[PDB]
Amino acid sequence: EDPMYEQFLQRIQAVRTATVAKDISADILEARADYFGRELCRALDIEYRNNVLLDEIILDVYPGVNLMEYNVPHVTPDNYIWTGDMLLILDYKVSVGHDSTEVTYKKYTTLILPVMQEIGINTEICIIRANPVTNQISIVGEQFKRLFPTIPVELNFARFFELRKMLLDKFAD
Numbered sequence: 559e560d561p562m563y564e565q566f567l568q569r570i571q572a573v574r575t576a577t578v579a580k581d582i583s584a585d586i587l588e589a590r591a592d593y594f595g596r597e598l599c600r601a602l603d604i605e606y607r608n609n610v611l612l613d614e615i616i617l618d619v620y621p622g623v624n625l626m627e628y629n630v631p632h633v634t635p636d637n638y639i640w641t642g643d644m645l646l647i648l649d650y651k652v653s654v655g656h657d658s659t660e661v662t663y664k665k666y667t668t669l670i671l672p673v674m675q676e677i678g679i680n681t682e683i684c685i686i687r688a689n690p691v692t693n694q695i696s697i698v699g700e701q702f703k704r705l706f707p708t709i710p711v712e713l714n715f716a717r718f719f720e721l722r723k724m725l726l727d728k729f730a731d
């Protein structure tokens with residue numbers, strides 16, 4: 559009774575090979591992390607965004623920038639927050655471990671902060687992560703942790719689990 563559930567469902571019923579089911583699994587993963595994002599933004603009263611290009615953020619905080627003199631990498635973090643002195647580069651994980659978080663922390667560290675350091679914008683990269691089994695939230699970014707001590711999120715990942723479970727049940731061999 560939700561488009562996302564029924565569109566994944568139809569796709570799980572139809573899928574016939576493991577090479578194609580892996581793309582469905584990747585699709586659910588990103589869908590689970592989008593819903594985390596929406597709820598997190600609603601819970602935090604910041605505007606919702608997903609996969610925004612670096613160039614667009616730069617030009618929303620800093621419209622006068624002489625862009626073409628900078629090598630601005632093509633990265634798309636999920637969202638950002640501009641305070642007037644600090645640029646919070648946001649990112650949504652949902653996971654039960656921290657490995658993927660560390661990957662995206664390193665990539666976004668070396669790919670974003672160099673150019674922001676030349677433009678002169680105080681940047682910090684923030685990965686918020688929800689454990690989907692236990693619902694605990696883990697935050698990286700001391701400035702984000704400060705600006706938001708209470709994260710009042712109401713999550714439920716059950717539809718995502720049922721989906722990724724049916725996919726595993728179909729290919730348990």
Ligand SMILES: [Mn+2]
Nearest residue numbers: 609634635636
């Ligand atoms: Mn993303």
